[PDB]
């Protein structure tokens, strides 16, 4: 069956750093861009919406403009990787990755953000 996996289900990231959280899904030798739909959400915020080989920025929440992107080259490897630069404290929480690719699945990932003076 179509299953989405997460290598790590809890990310502890430092304030102001860059974060890359990854969901893995099965891909054959070649990637069918028409069939792939990827949606990264947190709380009720539209982070990344990926359809027909391109990110849809018209629905992206303002909290993430030029702050987050889907690394398209990793999709070739069966990796939906969300990268968010300059992590803020308001980026901590539960992220959901939803992937449709023939079959459909989704997984949760928890992100803790470390305060600047916590280490």
């Amino acid at each position: 069956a179509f299953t989405v996996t997460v290598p790590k289900d809890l990310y502890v990231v430092e304030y102001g750093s860059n974060m890359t959280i990854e969901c893995k899904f099965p891909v054959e030798k070649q990637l069918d861009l028409a069939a792939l739909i990827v949606y990264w959400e947190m709380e009720d915020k539209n982070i990344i919406q990926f359809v027909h080989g391109e990110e849809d920025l018209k629905t992206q929440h303002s909290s993430y403009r030029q702050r987050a992107r889907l690394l398209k080259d990793q999709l070739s490897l069966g990796n939906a990787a969300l990268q968010i630069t300059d992590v803020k404290l308001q980026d901590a929480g539960v992220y959901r990755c939803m992937i449709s690719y023939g079959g459909a699945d989704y997984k949760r990932i928890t992100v803790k953000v470390n305060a600047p003076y916590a280490a």
Partner: peptide, 14 residues
Amino acid sequence: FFXGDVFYGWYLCK
């Protein structure tokens, strides 16, 4: 998130 029924019930964006 709109798109018909694609991941119906899996998301919270309205």
